[PDB]
């Protein structure tokens, strides 16, 4: 269980039917090219909490929850360098719905690679305990 300050790039929601971490990265690269997602997030920071329950993203004053990504519904999360030349680290989360009929992609940008990796480690430990 841990909290991190992150920025929010955006989401591609309600996709139907990306098996492979490389495929997800490529999918998002192309989505950015096609204007579905920004390349660079707005500067506004959010609080990302990671735990056994999943990932929660809240405003920086904790007054409002933006996203709740429950562990049950997380399919995979990929951490990667955005490739834009500044070494920024992204987290791309693939999630599904209660019936596992639709998928959504959520993309965040971390302050540092150390933090992105820390986030992944908590998530991986979370799955381990199941």
């Amino acid at each position: 269980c841990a909290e991190f300050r992150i920025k929010y790039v955006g989401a591609i929601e309600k996709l139907k039917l990306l098996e492979g971490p490389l495929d997800l990265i490529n999918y998002i690269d192309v989505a950015q090219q096609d204007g579905k997602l920004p390349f660079v997030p707005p500067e506004e920071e959010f609080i990302m909490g990671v735990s056994k329950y999943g990932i929660k993203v809240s405003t920086s004053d904790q007054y409002d929850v933006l996203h709740r990504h429950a562990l049950y519904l997380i399919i995979r999360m990929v951490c990667y360098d955005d490739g834009l030349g500044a070494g920024k680290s992204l987290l791309a989360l693939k999630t599904t719905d209660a019936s596992n009929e639709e998928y959504s992609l959520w993309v965040y940008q971390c302050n540092s690679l150390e933090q992105a990796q820390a986030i992944c480690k908590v998530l991986s430990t979370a799955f381990d305990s199941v």
Binding site: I25, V78, Y80, C120, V130
Partner: peptide
């Protein structure tokens, strides 16, 4: 444009429930 995904990937985490 940007380098290949292989050159950029750091780690991935998979939910075994859907694997």
């Amino acid at each position: 444009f940007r380098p290949s995904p292989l050159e950029r990937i750091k780690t991935n985490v998979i939910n075994p429930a859907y694997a």
